Write a protein that holds these residues in place. Structure first.
Motif, PDB file in Angstrom:
ATOM      1  N   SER A  60       0.810  -1.228   0.000  1.00 33.71           N
ATOM      2  CA  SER A  60       0.000   0.000   0.000  1.00 33.71           C
ATOM      3  C   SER A  60       0.842   1.276   0.000  1.00 33.71           C
ATOM      4  O   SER A  60       0.243   2.332  -0.206  1.00 33.71           O
ATOM      5  CB  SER A  60      -0.942   0.007   1.195  1.00 33.71           C
ATOM      6  OG  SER A  60      -0.197  -0.015   2.418  1.00 33.71           O
ATOM      7  N   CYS A  64      -1.595   0.399  -4.004  1.00 36.78           N
ATOM      8  CA  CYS A  64      -3.057   0.315  -3.764  1.00 36.78           C
ATOM      9  C   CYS A  64      -3.443   1.230  -2.614  1.00 36.78           C
ATOM     10  O   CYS A  64      -2.553   1.605  -1.814  1.00 36.78           O
ATOM     11  CB  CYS A  64      -3.503  -1.121  -3.505  1.00 36.78           C
ATOM     12  SG  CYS A  64      -2.753  -1.902  -2.050  1.00 36.78           S
ATOM     13  N   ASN A  65      -4.736   1.546  -2.501  1.00 34.25           N
ATOM     14  CA  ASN A  65      -5.285   2.376  -1.408  1.00 34.25           C
ATOM     15  C   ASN A  65      -5.927   1.473  -0.351  1.00 34.25           C
ATOM     16  O   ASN A  65      -6.887   0.729  -0.667  1.00 34.25           O
ATOM     17  CB  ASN A  65      -6.321   3.367  -1.921  1.00 34.25           C
ATOM     18  CG  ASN A  65      -6.906   4.128  -0.760  1.00 34.25           C
ATOM     19  OD1 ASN A  65      -6.173   4.804  -0.068  1.00 34.25           O
ATOM     20  ND2 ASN A  65      -8.184   3.935  -0.470  1.00 34.25           N
ATOM     21  N   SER A  72       0.977   7.880   0.957  1.00 32.33           N
ATOM     22  CA  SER A  72       1.299   6.786   0.008  1.00 32.33           C
ATOM     23  C   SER A  72       0.733   7.093  -1.383  1.00 32.33           C
ATOM     24  O   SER A  72      -0.040   8.037  -1.539  1.00 32.33           O
ATOM     25  CB  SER A  72       0.792   5.465   0.502  1.00 32.33           C
ATOM     26  OG  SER A  72      -0.621   5.404   0.461  1.00 32.33           O
ATOM     27  N   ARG A  73       1.116   6.285  -2.356  1.00 32.04           N
ATOM     28  CA  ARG A  73       0.567   6.336  -3.734  1.00 32.04           C
ATOM     29  C   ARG A  73      -0.388   5.151  -3.935  1.00 32.04           C
ATOM     30  O   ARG A  73      -0.400   4.230  -3.088  1.00 32.04           O
ATOM     31  CB  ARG A  73       1.711   6.301  -4.749  1.00 32.04           C
ATOM     32  CG  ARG A  73       2.670   7.480  -4.653  1.00 32.04           C
ATOM     33  CD  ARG A  73       3.872   7.221  -5.539  1.00 32.04           C
ATOM     34  NE  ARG A  73       4.858   8.294  -5.638  1.00 32.04           N
ATOM     35  CZ  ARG A  73       4.930   9.203  -6.616  1.00 32.04           C
ATOM     36  NH1 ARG A  73       4.034   9.228  -7.593  1.00 32.04           N
ATOM     37  NH2 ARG A  73       5.911  10.091  -6.605  1.00 32.04           N
ATOM     38  N   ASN A  74      -1.109   5.168  -5.056  1.00 33.39           N
ATOM     39  CA  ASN A  74      -2.058   4.110  -5.497  1.00 33.39           C
ATOM     40  C   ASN A  74      -1.814   3.871  -6.991  1.00 33.39           C
ATOM     41  O   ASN A  74      -2.696   4.163  -7.794  1.00 33.39           O
ATOM     42  CB  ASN A  74      -3.505   4.512  -5.196  1.00 33.39           C
ATOM     43  CG  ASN A  74      -4.532   3.463  -5.574  1.00 33.39           C
ATOM     44  OD1 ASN A  74      -4.197   2.350  -5.978  1.00 33.39           O
ATOM     45  ND2 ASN A  74      -5.805   3.802  -5.410  1.00 33.39           N
TER      46      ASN A  74
END
Ligand code: NA
Length: 129
Positions: A60, A64-65, A72-74
């Motif tokens: 995550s 991904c979220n 964070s990134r997704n």
């Protein structure tokens, strides 16, 4: 869902992982065995507060979220829960993005430490493919 070895080999081949970016099917099956023990529901919390999800333990921090990994990134544009499905489509699609740049399959710590340089073809032995 906990896949059998040859069952997961067959699913990964149908979803286009055999030789994806030059990585033979046995690399992917070996990576899944040591990341998740072939369990789509596997989760592991990391020191940085991120979590690894699903049969290929996708993180995550980047991919991904999960609503609990601040800053964070997704990059796979999915909720992390999509990676825990009995259907491996979302995990395979996201794995194809991960492997296509950066350090290739070195992104998977279990692959680098337990599969890389070994006889990974052994992981598809006896399978109807
Ligand atoms: Na994220």
């Amino acid at each position: 869902k906990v896949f059998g070895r040859c069952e997961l080999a067959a699913a990964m081949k149908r979803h286009g992982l055999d030789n994806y970016r030059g990585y033979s099917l046995g690399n992917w099956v070996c990576a899944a065995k040591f990341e998740s023990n072939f369990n789509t529901q596997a989760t592991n919390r990391n020191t940085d507060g991120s979590t690894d999800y699903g049969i290929l333990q996708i993180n995550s921090r980047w991919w991904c979220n999960d609503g609990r990994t601040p800053g964070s990134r997704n990059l796979c544009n999915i909720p992390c829960s999509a990676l825990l499905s009995s259907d491996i489509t979302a995990s395979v699609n996201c794995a194809k993005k991960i492997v296509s740049d950066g350090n290739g399959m070195n992104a998977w710590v279990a692959w680098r430490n337990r599969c890389k340089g070994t006889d990974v073809q052994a992981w598809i032995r006896g399978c109807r493919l």
